[PDB]
Amino acid sequence: ERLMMKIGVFVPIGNNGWLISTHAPQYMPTFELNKAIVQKAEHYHFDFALSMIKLRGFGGKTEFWDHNLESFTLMAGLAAVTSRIQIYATAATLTLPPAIVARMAATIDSISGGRFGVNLVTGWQKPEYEQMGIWPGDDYFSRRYDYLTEYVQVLRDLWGTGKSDFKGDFFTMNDCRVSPQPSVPMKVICAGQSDAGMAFSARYADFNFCFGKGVNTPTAFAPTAARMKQAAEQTGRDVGSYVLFMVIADETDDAARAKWEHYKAGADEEALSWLTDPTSAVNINMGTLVGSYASVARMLDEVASVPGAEGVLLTFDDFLSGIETFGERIQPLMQCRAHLP
Amino acid sequence: ERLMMKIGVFVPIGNNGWLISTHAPQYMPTFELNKAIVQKAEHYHFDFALSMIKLRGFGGKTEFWDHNLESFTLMAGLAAVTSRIQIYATAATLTLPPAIVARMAATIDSISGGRFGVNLVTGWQKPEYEQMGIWPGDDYFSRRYDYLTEYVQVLRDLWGTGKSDFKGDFFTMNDCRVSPQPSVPMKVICAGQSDAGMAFSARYADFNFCFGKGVNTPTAFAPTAARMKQAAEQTGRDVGSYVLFMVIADETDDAARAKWEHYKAGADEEALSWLTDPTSAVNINMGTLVGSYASVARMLDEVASVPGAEGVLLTFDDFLSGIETFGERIQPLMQCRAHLP
Ligand SMILES: Cc1cc2nc3c(=O)[nH]c(=O)nc-3n(C[C@H](O)[C@H](O)[C@H](O)COP(=O)(O)O)c2cc1C
Ligand SMILES: Cc1cc2nc3c(=O)[nH]c(=O)nc-3n(C[C@H](O)[C@H](O)[C@H](O)COP(=O)(O)O)c2cc1C
Ligand SMILES: O=c1cc[nH]c(=O)[nH]1
Numbered sequence: 159e160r161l162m163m164k165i166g167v168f169v170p171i172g173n174n175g176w177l178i179s180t181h182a183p184q185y186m187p188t189f190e191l192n193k194a195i196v197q198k199a200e201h202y203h204f205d206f207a208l209s210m211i212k213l214r215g216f217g218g219k220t221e222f223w224d225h226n227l228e229s230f231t232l233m234a235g236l237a238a239v240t241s242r243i244q245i246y247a248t249a250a251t252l253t254l255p256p257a258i259v260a261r262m263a264a265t266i267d268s269i270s271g272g273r274f275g276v277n278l279v280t281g282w283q284k285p286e287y288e289q290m291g292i293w294p295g296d297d298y299f300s301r302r303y304d305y306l307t308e309y310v311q312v313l314r315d316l317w318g319t320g321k322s323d324f325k326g327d328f329f330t331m332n333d334c335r336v337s338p339q340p341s342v343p344m345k346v347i348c349a350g351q352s353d354a355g356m357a358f359s360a361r362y363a364d365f366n367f368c369f370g371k372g373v374n375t376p377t378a379f380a381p382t383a384a385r386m387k388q389a390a391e392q393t394g395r396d397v398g399s400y401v402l403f404m405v406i407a408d409e410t411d412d413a414a415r416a417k418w419e420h421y422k423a424g425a426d427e428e429a430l431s432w433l434t435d436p437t438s439a440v441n442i443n444m445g446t447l448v449g450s451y452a453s454v455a456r457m458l459d460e461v462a463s464v465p466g467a468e469g470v471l472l473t474f475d476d477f478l479s480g481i482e483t484f485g486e487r488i489q490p491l492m493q494c495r496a497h498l499p
Numbered sequence: 500e501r502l503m504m505k506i507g508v509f510v511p512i513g514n515n516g517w518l519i520s521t522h523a524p525q526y527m528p529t530f531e532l533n534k535a536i537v538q539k540a541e542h543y544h545f546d547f548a549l550s551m552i553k554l555r556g557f558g559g560k561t562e563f564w565d566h567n568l569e570s571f572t573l574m575a576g577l578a579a580v581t582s583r584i585q586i587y588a589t590a591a592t593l594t595l596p597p598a599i600v601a602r603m604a605a606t607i608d609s610i611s612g613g614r615f616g617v618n619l620v621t622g623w624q625k626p627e628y629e630q631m632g633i634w635p636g637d638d639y640f641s642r643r644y645d646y647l648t649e650y651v652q653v654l655r656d657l658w659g660t661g662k663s664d665f666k667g668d669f670f671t672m673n674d675c676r677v678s679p680q681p682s683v684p685m686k687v688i689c690a691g692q693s694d695a696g697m698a699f700s701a702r703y704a705d706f707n708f709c710f711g712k713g714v715n716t717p718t719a720f721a722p723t724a725a726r727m728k729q730a731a732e733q734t735g736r737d738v739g740s741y742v743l744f745m746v747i748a749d750e751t752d753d754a755a756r757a758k759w760e761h762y763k764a765g766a767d768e769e770a771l772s773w774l775t776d777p778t779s780a781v782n783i784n785m786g787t788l789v790g791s792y793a794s795v796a797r798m799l800d801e802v803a804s805v806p807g808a809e810g811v812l813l814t815f816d817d818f819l820s821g822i823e824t825f826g827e828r829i830q831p832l833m834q835c836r837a838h839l840p
């Protein structure tokens with residue numbers, strides 16, 4: 159019952175991170191920026207770094223997510239300039255054959271010395287795929303986890319034995335070979351929120367990402383983590399929840415709130431239209447923690463007490479300064495991080 | 500007419516490099532080995548590093564190319580730990596959608612600061628693709644450069660304008676978007692030996708790889724480079740030849756020959772069966788230069804005089820020692836490298 163929680167950083171592979179506002183920091187996703195971010199996160203003992211994959215943006219004044227790097231190649235570069243932090247890339251399974259993902263994962267396993275894992279996603283936004291002629295049709299919405307189930311069986315064969323003879327509705331392996339196999343058991347993580355998605359995660363994932371909920375209501379996601387725990391019961395597997403939040407912290411509650419309101423007041427409404435104390439569309443209605451460093455520490459400790467919650471995935475309004483103030487001012491106050499040096 | 504030639508290293512992304520022999524150095528392709536190789540090549544002013552993609556091996560006593568990393572992720576890692584050498588990854592175009600390759604190339608452009616390019620290949624070995632159910636059928640042999648022509652049109656649209664509406668027999672783009680665009684014009688290279696392959700390279704490539712020929716007959720490839728020059732005439736484009744050789748050099752001709760014979764005497768005949776002063780199957784009948792450091796320097800200077808030859812792509816019997824003796828003993832004697840510091 160002693161508080162212990164893992165901390166990850168959701169790295170800005172897309173421009174402007176997760177704020178859709180002309181008052182938010184404006185920046186392009188460069189390798190050097192993400193290198194600075196992940197090296198600083200590693201310095202402050204963040205447990206992992208994850209990048210999403212986003213194949214189409216939302217336009218507007220800030221050209222929001224119009225500029226995005228590719229996840230496996232970004233994480234391969236970050237693996238080469240880190241030494242301790244876990245590194246996860248996202249595979250949009252419609253865009254990469256499973257044997258290619260299998261070999262890419264083995265490659266970054268080699269780059270990182272065993273620190274690499276894969277976030278498997280089905281894809282949900284039809285424009286990302288229709289734009290390049292690979293959308294399977296609106297049958298995909300209901301069948302996508304059948305597809306993902308075949309996909310991961312191929313991956314598990316290849317990582318586990320170096321070969322696959324899997325034959326299904328979507329893939330045909332005829333003694334497919336991928337070697338080297340990963341030096342350590344390959345980590346698979348998933349971000350399913352639906353019943354079907356959580357059932358997939360319960361069978362195949364090491365843990366499951368879910369959305370934090372509300373502004374300064376850190377435990378509001380609890381029913382989602384409860385559903386994941388029950389999905390995991392149905393496989394007997396230990397598959398905890400990692401919860402996505404944005405942290406907007408400052409010296410005082412008032413100063414942090416002033417920033418949050420300043421961001422909301424610059425909302426890039428044209429971009430928000432394309433994408434279409436309450437949450438705000440300015441950060442895609444993300445669960446948000448806004449307060450003094452001590453207030454954010456207290457609220458993150460609350461997250462750690464939720465049944466099934468094993469970690470948080472953090473975005474910030476400003477990653478370079480936000481990681482620094484998290485490491486210097488927030489994390490030392492967190493009971494659930496007392497295990498760190 | 501003053502000798503000037505570029506030098507590249509063909510990095511061992513597959514186990515044991517390019518020797519199929521129990522008397523050859525035995526090693527796995529690791530990131531750390533390829534990092535040591537490319538950093539040493541960069542130190543000696545090699546112009547570029549290229550990795551192939553090989554999705555299935557040939558077995559035998561040495562499990563030859565049974566163990567292979569993936570090219571884009573390997574080169575992304577190498578880009579992060581280099582600063583001057585050009586970095587090329589190979590895309591087997593049947594395995595990756597063009598918009599994904601486009602974004603991966605933009606990503607390694609960002610990692611490398613503008614040092615990245617793509618070697619586009621159609622694929623030729625049916626088992627590499629049939630094993631994962633993606634071989635298009637034996638029509639592909641005659642249509643593969645039609646396919647590659649559509650593929651590169653999509654790439655050129657995306658790198659050039661950030662978007663594509665290309666519609667063809669093999670791809671359908673509906674306002675496909677990839678941004679960021681590369682910071683510098685994206686380099687495309689090809690390795691076509693056939694009439695159709697050279698015609699593709701003449702239209703779309705910056706240069707074309709061809710095979711060196713014979714043992715210690717450095718200019719024997721000349722008719723191939725002559726055919727490439729004539730293909731380039733038909734587009735008005737400047738598309739030179741880069742010639743693949745293995746270098747087996749030592750203090751004396753006799754010592755280098757003794758190594759070459761020692762390698763041939765350990766030929767892994769079971770692996771050679773699967774793959775199926777003369778060239779030898781022990782290095783896939785590669786053009787090979789065997790001699791003292793001074794003899795190899797003289798022969799490489801001969802290569803530089805061949806019409807159309809602009810560079811060489813080098814393998815070695817031992818990459819770590821071979822790059823060192825190339826930099827310390829061979830390159831200082833090469834008239835075509837007198838431009839280096
Ligand atoms: C932290 C997190 C990261 C995600 N990253 C991606 C991504 O990179 N690409 C993607 O297509 N979907 C991504 N998703 C969406 C999920 O894969 C999933 O489709 C979504 O949570 C809806 O759940 P469902 O698939 O069970 O309906 C992400 C979700 C979460 C919570
Ligand atoms: C230096 C070099 C590297 C090559 N690398 C690859 C590779 O990584 N993957 C591949 O499928 N083919 C590779 N090839 C084969 C060529 O793409 C091409 O198919 C072959 O040279 C035959 O020429 P053609 O396609 O015009 O018939 C390579 C060839 C050369 C000369
Ligand atoms: O799907 C996604 C990806 C990144 N961030 C989100 O909030 N949702």
Ligand SMILES: O=c1cc[nH]c(=O)[nH]1
Pocket residue numbers: 551783785
């Ligand atoms: O096709 C190939 C690839 C690497 N080396 C070769 O000799 N041929």
